[PDB]
Amino acid sequence: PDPCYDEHGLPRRCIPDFVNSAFGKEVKVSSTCGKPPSRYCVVTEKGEEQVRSCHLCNASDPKRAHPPSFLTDLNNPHNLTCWQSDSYVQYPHNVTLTLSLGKKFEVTYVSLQFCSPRPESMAIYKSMDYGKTWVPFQFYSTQCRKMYNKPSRAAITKQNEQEAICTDSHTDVRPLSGGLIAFSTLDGRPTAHDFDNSPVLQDWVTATDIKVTFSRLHTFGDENEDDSELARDSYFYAVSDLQVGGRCKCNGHASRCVRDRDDNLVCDCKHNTAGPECDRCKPFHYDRPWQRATAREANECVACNCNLHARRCRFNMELYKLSGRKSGGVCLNCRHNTAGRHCHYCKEGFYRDLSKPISHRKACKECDCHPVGAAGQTCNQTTGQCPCKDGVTGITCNRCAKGYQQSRSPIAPCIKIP
Amino acid sequence: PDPCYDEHGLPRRCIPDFVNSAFGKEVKVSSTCGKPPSRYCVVTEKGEEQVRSCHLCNASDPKRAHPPSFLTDLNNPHNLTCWQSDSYVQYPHNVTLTLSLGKKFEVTYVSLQFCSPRPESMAIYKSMDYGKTWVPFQFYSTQCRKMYNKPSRAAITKQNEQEAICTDSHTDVRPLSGGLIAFSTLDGRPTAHDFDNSPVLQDWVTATDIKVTFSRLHTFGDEARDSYFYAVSDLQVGGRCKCNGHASRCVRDRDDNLVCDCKHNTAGPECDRCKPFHYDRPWQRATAREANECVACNCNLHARRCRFNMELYKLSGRKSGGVCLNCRHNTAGRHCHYCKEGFYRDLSKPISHRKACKECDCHPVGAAGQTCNQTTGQCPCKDGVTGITCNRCAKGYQQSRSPIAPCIKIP
Ligand SMILES: O=S(=O)(O)OC[C@H]1O[C@@](COS(=O)(=O)O)(O[C@H]2O[C@H](COS(=O)(=O)O)[C@@H](OS(=O)(=O)O)[C@H](OS(=O)(=O)O)[C@H]2OS(=O)(=O)O)[C@@H](OS(=O)(=O)O)[C@@H]1OS(=O)(=O)O
Ligand SMILES: *[C@@H]1O[C@H](CO)[C@@H](O[C@@H]2O[C@H](CO)[C@@H](O[C@@H]3O[C@H](CO)[C@@H](O)[C@H](O)[C@@H]3O)[C@H](O)[C@H]2NC(C)=O)[C@H](O)[C@H]1NC(C)=O
Ligand SMILES: *[C@@H]1O[C@H](CO)[C@@H](O[C@@H]2O[C@H](CO)[C@@H](O)[C@H](O)[C@H]2NC(C)=O)[C@H](O)[C@H]1NC(C)=O
Ligand SMILES: *[C@@H]1O[C@H](CO)[C@@H](O[C@@H]2O[C@H](CO)[C@@H](O)[C@H](O)[C@H]2NC(C)=O)[C@H](O)[C@H]1NC(C)=O
Ligand SMILES: *[C@@H]1O[C@H](CO)[C@@H](O[C@@H]2O[C@H](CO)[C@@H](O)[C@H](O)[C@H]2NC(C)=O)[C@H](O)[C@H]1NC(C)=O
Ligand SMILES: *[C@@H]1O[C@H](CO)[C@@H](O[C@@H]2O[C@H](CO)[C@@H](O)[C@H](O)[C@H]2NC(C)=O)[C@H](O)[C@H]1NC(C)=O
Ligand SMILES: *[C@@H]1O[C@H](CO)[C@@H](O[C@@H]2O[C@H](CO)[C@@H](O)[C@H](O)[C@H]2NC(C)=O)[C@H](O)[C@H]1NC(C)=O
Ligand SMILES: *[C@@H]1O[C@H](CO)[C@@H](O[C@@H]2O[C@H](CO)[C@@H](O)[C@H](O)[C@H]2NC(C)=O)[C@H](O)[C@H]1NC(C)=O
Ligand SMILES: *[C@@H]1O[C@H](CO)[C@@H](O[C@@H]2O[C@H](CO)[C@@H](O)[C@H](O)[C@H]2NC(C)=O)[C@H](O)[C@H]1NC(C)=O
Ligand SMILES: [Ca+2]
Ligand SMILES: [Ca+2]
Ligand SMILES: [Cl-]
Ligand code: NA
């Protein structure tokens, strides 16, 4: 059926599946070996000795070429997809990785599996928009204050839950190969248990781009020396899999994200909502403002009540809060000769045809006063009583009253009688 | 002071004095002795013999020149001033005397004094226009059928009271000097005792000019020295100036015309119509006990023109019938008594006041329409809005901003 609705047809909060938003995605890096072709040294241990090896990184040979595509391809522990940068991009220089998702995702984690020694200092940034503004998100480094000007392992308080935490944890050389770095956005967040009812954390987890900056790099004594190896050296960055798990952000009003008219990813919004993340909500559904989907309530925009007359409408906060936070939408351009907040009364020049229901389109008969016996041509919108002149009476003014006699005058049709 | 209104100022029927409309006025003649000066001859009597004479008539000598002026001048039984015609003007020749009065009188009598012997056949005509059409008014002759083709001494039917009658009374030669012929406009006339309620007779006596035609002259003697002429001492047409009972004097106009001092809110030459805006009741001739005045229209000081509808008058019980035209001052109705659509009666001012009808000052937010009640001025309020102009929220309703929904009900 539809996960956004129950078996009785009422709406319930729905959420897309959890996936790696980076699988198969293209990646943009500021470094990669191949142009020109160079060598790289890899130290592999065997019992106790080490003895480093040497290999060549061929830009053309698929069998010695490390393209950024290996970051988001199918990772296989028995046969890795290593991406290697250039040679000795040491501080202050830094290799940056930028991933564009083309859709607001609620990030749950960001993991980098390095087939070489993990970085001494890396930075993980996000983008709230679609690549214009970046925001700190996690930091790793042996000298937090010295390099990222962050205090080591800051205290996370409700006063500032979006703190970018720097840590000297996970920033160790060995394992010289296959080291992980996994950043969980909700770990240690004060209000992470009450996420649906914490907007600060919803903003904290939402992002459309992920930047990864590799600031410093681990080294040993081999740096100046003399045999520094001016053509390749063995210090470098290298990651075999880059994962960024999470969910497509739909504020709980979409079971799944689909492909746009222009191939862009967007929520298949339900509950009468619209917009890429089901933030706003469909036309004519503007009674009661838009809220996020919660486990307790579905909170879908409700349509305006216009007694089946007007089509457009529009939400009003004051009317909403002044009606007990129940109805705040007013109707627009009432058709069928009506008017008012809900198209509930007939406009001047017409009256309420009570014989027919207010929802009916003929619920507003015109005035139809009498050209001779009526003093005006604008009847009572409530009763349809035309203003009768002197001797004339009725609702349409087409007859004389008691003590008054009919006449052939257009001006004085009835006249009293003594 | 004015006889058209009593002490209380109530209008009572009034009439101009009874005068001789001929005195002074000039008569138009056709035959006057004097042209190539000739002579005549009057004849007297001595009991048996017919002693006659013969005198001269000059066209210049004051002491011998019988002019037409001698018909309407100061007349006295002594030193009598006589008009005379050229001698020998017997059948079928005519001697006419027209008199234009200038305005419609109600002729009462037509008198003639005859220095010569009275005529054998004479006729009195009149005009109710001004010399254009001339109708027969009385005939005098011995041979009526023969000459005027009128039945001698017929009867005045109520069906034809405007009938000229020929008669042989006053047609004798009896008085050679001083013959009187007088025509009473209402002799023989059936409804004469009810003149004041007899429109036929009122039309009959109305006349603007008068023509006396002399026809056959009495050859008296039977013996040349024929000398048979017409000679009238004084012509007296006595009557009142026709003002239909709404005037006490006739006076001279802004164009120098004899007309009526039309009172009783009437207008016109003979007070035959109502004055402007005094069209509430149909015009009638003043009666003794009635005075049928012209009554103005009550447009409560809001209209300049009035028009009369007889249908309205009759269904009104013969009361009013005047419909006002162009009700100004933002009013409408027969008598400009109610405020047209978009205005309302300000009952603080009086109906006659210019600002008796104010406008609709209906709040554009609190009102569902922009038309007052006209009687109350209240204007179509919407939902939780009260006030004549829909300017305030009601009880239990709270002000907002939204013009579509000004007031909203509280918890
Ligand atoms: O209807 S018109 O606009 O064409 O006016 C026609 C002429 O009437 C005058 C006065 O004429 S006068 O007798 O020679 O003094 O103005 C008057 O017209 C109407 C009422 O008379 S009506 O003929 O029944 O229409 C009034 O206007 S309204 O209230 O009906 O809207 C005038 O009042 S006002 O001047 O608008 O204040 C009324 O004049 S008043 O009330 O006596 O003061 C002439 O106007 S005038 O210039 O004051 O003399 C009109 O001729 S004109 O071309 O406007 O001059
Ligand atoms: C190495 O690390 C830094 C930060 O992690 C990466 O961002 C670079 O940082 C510097 C400032 O430290 C930026 O310099 C600025 O450039 C603009 C001109 O566009 C100028 O207006 C500023 O006054 C300032 O000088 C620098 O722009 C920024 N690098 C880029 C490409 O924007 C840096 O990218 C890392 N190195 C590499 C190769 O990625
Ligand atoms: C590995 O790299 C070498 C060169 O760095 C490639 O050998 C030749 O490279 C030149 C370009 O500089 C080409 O013009 C030749 O065609 C290459 N020789 C060939 C294709 O036989 C070498 O091709 C690369 N490995 C593979 C599989 O192509
Ligand atoms: C791991 O991948 C390598 C190569 O990607 C496999 O060795 C073969 O290498 C040649 C290169 O010319 C490829 O054409 C072959 O496709 C590779 N063999 C196979 C079965 O794919 C190596 O076998 C792979 N090891 C495992 C356990 O899958
Ligand atoms: C009849 O008509 C004229 C007007 O009177 C007379 O002419 C008069 O002739 C006398 C004789 O010389 C003159 O003295 C007068 O000048 C004329 N009269 C006037 C008034 O001017 C004519 O004679 C008259 N016949 C008689 C008898 O009076
Ligand atoms: C009639 O008016 C005339 C106007 O002149 C007058 O005629 C005079 O009559 C008397 C005798 O009656 C004579 O003595 C005179 O000669 C006439 N001439 C004048 C100049 O007076 C007179 O006033 C009146 N005549 C009569 C009879 O009353
Ligand atoms: C007799 O009076 C008759 C009419 O009563 C006169 O005849 C009319 O005279 C006027 C002249 O002003 C003409 O306009 C009319 O056309 C005449 N009537 C007809 C029917 O022709 C007449 O002048 C008098 N007759 C005589 C002989 O003197
Ligand atoms: C305009 O106001 C008058 C008077 O207020 C209306 O006439 C009556 O008003 C009372 C209330 O004031 C009502 O209860 C009656 O129903 C009204 N009619 C009668 C016969 O009493 C008048 O109807 C109002 N104008 C319009 C268009 O309804
Ligand atoms: C249309 O009809 C209704 C009922 O007659 C009018 O509303 C009432 O009008 C009277 C006026 O005397 C008030 O006393 C009542 O308080 C009104 N009812 C309510 C619930 O307030 C209405 O005014 C009429 N429309 C117009 C323009 O007069
Ligand atoms: Ca991989
Ligand atoms: Ca005289
Ligand atoms: Cl007749
Ligand atoms: Na080295």
Numbering used by the authors:
A (entry chain A): 40 to 457
B (entry chain B): 40 to 262, 270 to 457
Paper text:
Netrin-1 (NET1) is a chemotropic guidance cue pivotal to vertebrate development, where it plays a key role in attraction and repulsion of axons, cell migration, regulation of cell survival, and cellular differentiation. It is secreted by axonal target cells and functions as both a short and long-range bifunctional guidance protein for axonal growth cones. The dependence receptors deleted in colorectal cancer (DCC) and its paralogue neogenin (NEO1) are crucial for NET1-mediated axon attraction, cell-cell adhesion, and tissue organisation. Heparan sulphate proteoglycans (HSPGs) such as glypican are cell surface receptors that modulate NET1 signalling by acting as attachment points and modulators to fine-tune axonal responses.
To investigate the structural basis of GAG recognition by NET1ΔC, we performed crystallographic studies in combination with site-directed mutagenesis and MD simulations. Our crystal structure reveal an antiparallel NET1ΔC dimer in the asymmetric unit in complex with one sucrose-octasulfate molecule bound per monomer. Our findings assign the LE-2 subdomain of NET1 as the major GAG binding epitope. Overall, the positively charged recognition surface area covers over 1085 Å2, offering extended recognition sites for acidic ligands. Remarkably, both SOS moieties, named SOSab and SOScd, showed interaction plasticity and span a distance of ~26 Å across NET1ΔC. In summary, NET1 provides a remarkably extended GAG recognition surface by combining relatively short, widely spaced basic amino acid residue fragments to generate an extended high-affinity GAG-binding site. Both the Cardin-Weintraub motif and the RH-HR tandem motif contribute to NET1-mediated GAG interactions.
